[PDB]
Every structure is written in structure tokens, then in C-alpha cells.
């Protein structure tokens, strides 16, 4: 239907994405009690659950997303939800070297990740990604473009003309990223070099997601913490073992 999404300027793309940004939520962190594996897992999954509700409504404001039938909408979110949580965490942890800002009242270092079995390996990967973004001086406008790319791209290969629509929007976001870099004064060569650097990081985010999904699954299968019904269904969408 020619689509309002493709009829958006680069500046219109940025504005829409910036406005659609979800708020920063708080943790249920209680500083009166020590951390256990269960209580920390409970804290993080409780947070993820509430973030998921905002993510679903954020997705519907991502240009082109609601043009999809409900079944691919579900598919894309099921595939990318942990990736999206991770790029967001990594983004808001940027100016906190050696720490992960899950919430304004939940700032954790790798040593606190040791409280949960096998979670410190995940923290390390997230922290390294955060260092990479900080080293690159990742901009907010670039961040929202990347996060939308993750939503549209991660599950598109697991699906005609419906995939073509997604690719048209992805191309528009590519055009937007270049437009941003050009306005920032980057040379033509620096533009495609930076574009590549940012997109290659998405490969590591995918990797972190698959590892985090397996970890969350193993925690669930050992009754360490009860997951919400929504979280169980997002996790179940990946089968796993």
C-alpha cells in the first residue's frame, strides 16, 4: 500500500524512533537482604517481564511493523526480544565502565554476576559490547536505528512480498544511518566503514542472545525461579535444549 514508512524522510525516521523510545524502569531491588541465585534471577526476570510490555508497544510504533499481519509480528518479537533487551542494556550502561545498568537502582558489576551460576560469562559479553559502543561514541540516533534493525531483521530469515516490505524498511533505516553519519561530518569513506562496524556488532548481540536464552532455559528447568507466563512463552518460542 505504498506505505507511509517508505514515504518517510531520514529526519522523519529518526524523530519517530526517538519518540517511540520506552522509559527506563526500576528494579524491585531490596537492599535489606543479601543476594542469592534465586533472588537475583527473580529480580532480573521480573524486570525483563515489565520491559517486555513496553517493548511490545514500542514495536508497534516502529515504522512498517504494524503493516505486518499478527503472525509475523509475533514471530519477529519472539526472535528478537532478548536481543532488544541486550542492546538497550548495553546502551544505558555505556557511561558506566565495568558495570551494567539494568535499572537506576540496579547497577551490577561482573562479580555480582557470579551470584548466579553461569551468568558472569554473559555479563562479560554484555560489558565488552558496552565498552565497544563507548569506544565508538555510539549516538542515540544511531542506537534507535540499530534496535529497530534488530527487530525487523533477526526473524526475517525464518519466514513473499511480506519479507520484501521488511527489507524496504530496513533499507530506509540504512539510508537513515548514513544520513546521520553524513550530518555528523564523517567523510564518505568513514560512513560506510562505521556502518559496517555497527552492523557487525549485531552479530555479537545475536550470539549473546542465544547464550542468554540457553542460560535462562537452564534456570527455568532447575526451578531456580518462576517465570511469568509471557516470559515462558517468549522462551518457549526458541525450543532449545
Amino acid at each position: 500500500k505504498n506505505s507511509l514508512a517508505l514515504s518517510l524522510t531520514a529526519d522523519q525516521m529518526v524523530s519517530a524512533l526517538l519518540d517511540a523510545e520506552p522509559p527506563i524502569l526500576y528494579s524491585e531491588y531490596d537492599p535489606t537482604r543479601p543476594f542469592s541465585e534465586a533472588s537475583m534471577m527473580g529480580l532480573l526476570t521480573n524486570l525483563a517481564d515489565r520491559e517486555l510490555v513496553h517493548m511490545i508497544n514500542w514495536a508497534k510504533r516502529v515504522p512498517g511493523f504494524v503493516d505486518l499481519t499478527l503472525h509475523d509480528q509475533v514471530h519477529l518479537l519472539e526472535c528478537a526480544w532478548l536481543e532488544i533487551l541486550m542492546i538497550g542494556l548495553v546502551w544505558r550502561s555505556m557511561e558506566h565502565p565495568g558495570k551494567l545498568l539494568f535499572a537506576p537502582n540496579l547497577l551490577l558489576d561482573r562479580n555480582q554476576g557470579k551470584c548466579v551460576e553461569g551468568m558472569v560469562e554473559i555479563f562479560d559479553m554484555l560489558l565488552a559490547t558496552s565498552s565497544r559502543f563507548r569506544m565508538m561514541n555510539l549516538q542515540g540516533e544511531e542506537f534507535v536505528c540499530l534496535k529497530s534493525i534488530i527487530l525487523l531483521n533477526s526473524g526475517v530469515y525464518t519466514f513473499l512480498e511480506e519479507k520484501d516490505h521488511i527489507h524496504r524498511v530496513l533499507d530506509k533505516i540504512t539510508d537513515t544511518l548514513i544520513h546521520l553519519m553524513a550530518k555528523a561530518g564523517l567523510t564518505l569513506q568513514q560512513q560506510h566503514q562505521r556502518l559496517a562496524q555497527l552492523l557487525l556488532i549485531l552479530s555479537h548481540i545475536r550470539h549473546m542472545s542465544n547464550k542468554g536464552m540457553e542460560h535462562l532455559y537452564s534456570m527455568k528447568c532447575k526451578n531456580v525461579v518462576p517465570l511469568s507466563d509471557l516470559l515462558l512463552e517468549m522462551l518457549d518460542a526458541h525450543r532449545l535444549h
Partner: peptide, 10 residues
């Protein structure tokens, strides 16, 4: 059915 399916239209 799925909760995600329901939430995507509320």
C-alpha cells in the same frame, strides 16, 4: 492463545 498475540492488539 498466546499472550504476545493478545498484547499486540491491546
Amino acid at each position: 492463545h498466546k499472550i504476545l498475540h493478545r498484547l499486540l492488539q491491546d
